[PDB]
Write a protein that binds this DNA or RNA. Sequence first.
RNA 1: AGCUGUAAGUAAGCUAUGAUCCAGAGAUUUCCGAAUGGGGGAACCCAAUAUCUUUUAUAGGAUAUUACUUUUCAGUGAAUACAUAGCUGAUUAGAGGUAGACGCAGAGAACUGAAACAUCUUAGUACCUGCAGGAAGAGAAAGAAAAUUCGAUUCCCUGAGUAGCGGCGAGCGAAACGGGAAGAGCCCAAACCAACAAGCUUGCUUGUUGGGGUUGUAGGACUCCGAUAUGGUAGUCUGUUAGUAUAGUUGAAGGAUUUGGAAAAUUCCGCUAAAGAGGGUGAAAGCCCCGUAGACGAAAUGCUGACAACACCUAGGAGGAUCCUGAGUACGGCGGAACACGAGAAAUUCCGUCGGAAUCCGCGGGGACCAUCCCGCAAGGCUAAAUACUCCCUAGUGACCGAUAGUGAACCAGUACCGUGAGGGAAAGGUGAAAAGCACCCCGGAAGGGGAGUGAAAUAGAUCCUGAAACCGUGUGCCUACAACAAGUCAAAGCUCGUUAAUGAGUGAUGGCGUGCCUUUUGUAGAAUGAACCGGCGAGUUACGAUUGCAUGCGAGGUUAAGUCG
RNA 2: GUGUAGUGGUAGGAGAGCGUUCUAAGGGCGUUGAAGGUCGAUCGUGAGGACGGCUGGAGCGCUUAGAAGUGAGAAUGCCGGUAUGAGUAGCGAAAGACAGGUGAGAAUCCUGUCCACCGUAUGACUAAGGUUUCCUGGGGAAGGCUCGUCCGCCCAGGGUUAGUCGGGACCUAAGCCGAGGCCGAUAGGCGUAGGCGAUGGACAACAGGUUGAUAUUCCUGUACCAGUUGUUUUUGUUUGA
RNA 3: CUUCUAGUGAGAAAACAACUGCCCGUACCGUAAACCGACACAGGUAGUCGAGGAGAGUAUCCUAAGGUGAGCGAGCGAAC
RNA 4: GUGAAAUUUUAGUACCUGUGAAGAUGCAGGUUACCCGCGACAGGACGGAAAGACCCCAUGGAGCUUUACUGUAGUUUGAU
Length: 101
Amino acid sequence: MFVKKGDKVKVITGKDKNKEGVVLAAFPKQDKVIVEGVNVVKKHQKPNQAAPQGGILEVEAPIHVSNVMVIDPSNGEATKVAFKEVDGKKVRVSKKTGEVL
RNA sequence: AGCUGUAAGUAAGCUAUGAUCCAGAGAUUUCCGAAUGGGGGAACCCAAUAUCUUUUAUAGGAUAUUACUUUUCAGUGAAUACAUAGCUGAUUAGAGGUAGACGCAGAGAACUGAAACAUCUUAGUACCUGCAGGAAGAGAAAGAAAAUUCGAUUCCCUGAGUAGCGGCGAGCGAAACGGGAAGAGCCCAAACCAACAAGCUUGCUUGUUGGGGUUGUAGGACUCCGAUAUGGUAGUCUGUUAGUAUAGUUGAAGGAUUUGGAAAAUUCCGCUAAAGAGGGUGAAAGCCCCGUAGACGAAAUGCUGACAACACCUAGGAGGAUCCUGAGUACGGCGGAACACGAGAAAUUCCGUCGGAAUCCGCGGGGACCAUCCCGCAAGGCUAAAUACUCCCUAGUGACCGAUAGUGAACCAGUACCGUGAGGGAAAGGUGAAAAGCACCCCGGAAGGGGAGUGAAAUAGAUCCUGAAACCGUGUGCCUACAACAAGUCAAAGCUCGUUAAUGAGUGAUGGCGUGCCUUUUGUAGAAUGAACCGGCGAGUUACGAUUGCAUGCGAGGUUAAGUCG
RNA sequence: GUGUAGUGGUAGGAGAGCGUUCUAAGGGCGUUGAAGGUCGAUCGUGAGGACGGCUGGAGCGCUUAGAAGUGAGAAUGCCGGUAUGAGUAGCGAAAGACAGGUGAGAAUCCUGUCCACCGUAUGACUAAGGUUUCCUGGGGAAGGCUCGUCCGCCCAGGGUUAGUCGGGACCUAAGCCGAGGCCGAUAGGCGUAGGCGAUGGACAACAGGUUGAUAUUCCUGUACCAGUUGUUUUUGUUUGA
RNA sequence: CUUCUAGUGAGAAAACAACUGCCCGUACCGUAAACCGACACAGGUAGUCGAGGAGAGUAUCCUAAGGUGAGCGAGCGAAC
RNA sequence: GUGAAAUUUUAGUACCUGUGAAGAUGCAGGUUACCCGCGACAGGACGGAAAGACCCCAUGGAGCUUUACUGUAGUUUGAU
């Protein structure tokens, strides 16, 4: 998975190159994860309890993890995350000159 | 680090004090069902006895036990005295299922071939029933042989389509030798020796224990001396270790440009590999993701080794006076079966009935029977491996299928449905990358539709990828109301066009000529026979033998098989 | 080159070729559009092959060799779809008319009036058998031999009360099962004791009212059967209790 | 069920009062559109009740209580 | 208003005397005939439904008879 709920992210593929954001929800069990301002979709909502009207809304849609990097925050780039045996947990450890997340 | 199945939704919550999830050990398990207290139309009803409960008590509630048969033991018992049925109580084990497979037996067909059919074959097969095991059955020579011998059993190659059998017809069909896989041998009865019991014949007979002994070069008992060792295991659920099966952990290297909605595509310039097998991501990735090559890992449970400890088993030499060496057995007649062998000149092996041997100077066999010779010792048991199968689990592979194929069944299928019953048995997969699954207006009761929107694409709108043919429609360029047309082809005026650019395309007034297609038949338009039309499936193949042509490698030579490493 | 010669044909023999799927190596094409579909006035002696226009949107060609579930117009073939007959035959015995409702819509639904049919039954109660069809409120896509606002249809909610009634906690007939037992290649066959088995025997409740649906069940009133407790009246278990 | 003895074997009758009484079936159709016949079918379905006038009568004709008007019609008024 | 069926090689489906597998809508030579329907009849399409029930064959079946062949359940007789 290598991606948690709150974890900034770069997008590599799919009409949102280079655009970053914050992961909101994590769906493992189908490998989908939704971010902010990357997958805007227009929903023809019908008049409902919520939103008595029927506006055209704009929310985000899931993206497959093969389109998502992780972030440095110590530095600010993308790292093909590796794992290290730091003290008795496995804290993710960046590649590309040794960061610690 | 998210979670409360399929499955949208809302309400309720859980979770870094480590959920949900994975793996190993445990706990609870309603009612029927061999069904087992009795009864029964299965998933129901009604009991007995003890203990404890609710109400003043009656009814009500829960717990435990109570079937049949046999194997051991007590008691009771009595036609009949003594004790034997019997009864009572306690105790031991059984009883049903199947993996539609493999094994061993009991019982056991017809169509079919013989161009008919009686002996024969199809066949000791199909089906029924009993009895098991992870394998079973066979197994330690009364053998095979025939000089010169070999020494348990099973399985495979070759012997060989040979010797044989057969209304000598259709057909059935071995075995030893030789080459290989795996190897392995043990335990009793008897004669004798002791202790206990009985008849104590007080003769020594019976019995039970324990000891002694297991064979063809005949062995043992029995007598006499040595030793009292030396080698073994096909036993333990006893420990100690090592490995492995069931959850896992780690795991290398990329950017930019052009087309796109989206790059893994294209063009530059880089990097990694004990890792270029595979699967996935908005099209086709060695460098995004899951992985692969490597390296590490078990608290619990199971298996397999190894060595410990315990259990069990096993001794020489010499003598030959007497004793032992499996009885209604071997074998004979009779009637049937089994051996390739159908009574045949018929040995060998079984079954039913009757007759009935010897005891080592003895017995069986060498395909009727006799003689010499040679090889063995039946009428008592046990025994791993090499062999056959796959309901099930794990990991893989395929010049195997791709929704009329492949299982009957890719989907909630042995279901829907049919038959009282046993039983018979279908059709049905595909939106897009992501539901973003069409807010809002308009006609319309609704269904349905038209704009506007989502979308790269709505002729991808839920009957949802592509979307052929029969069949049903709309528009139009050319012809048709004096005409007898297997429906065409050859000839041809006019009218409208303008192509893969060439002695062009469409239609067609009028003339010439002309009795469909298939099969079967001496002969077809036949009034002989088949097709309603379109689509899909739907027929000389494979294994083992034999023979001839072509070709290739060696040639008076050719050539391996089973089997072992791979 | 050039001469000579031959070239109908069923059963059948011989020879050479076209095309489909897959495997192997080499070389290729593809979002700047592959397979598949449609149209075209093109090429070779044949089976057959190219090229271009439109649709369509993810994989396929070419060469050499190999292996086959390799070629379809007929089996009164098998499966699906659609025709002809044809808007034809039929619409499954029996009498309706009007007014007003209801509603987008009416001969076919509701209401009213007159008429008419059966009446040892086309009326009332029960045993089988069916298995929620019963009642209340909604709906009109499919069933209804037409129509349909309606329904035995679809959706949602809700209805079946027992000491006395029928059966069990009672008895047995035909029949069946049958501890022991008697027979039989296995399987099993038959049967004693004992049981199971209503169509039969035996046995304690009547009238009226109540709902949208239940009524010897609910309610009212008057009873009955068999038992249990509490104060209310005769003693040797011998048995005169 | 009624009796009689063999029989284990305090002292039970009846006052009245007050209580206890288990499981299963109960809707609906039932000479029918709800069962048996593939059907909303001119067939089949055991038992009880089953009225009036005449009339021997459950026969026949019209009728009471009670139920039904049947699931395609409107025209014309030829052959057959 | 609703709405089938058996059948069906494609059909622009005339009459006579011939001819022919020996009785023709379709061949030959002649005669009659404008195109499309609607209600009736049943001469023909060797008309439709049942791959002849009559007859022969298959070295085909099945059921039955007997002094056809071969056997056998059953009844009886003798030895043991």
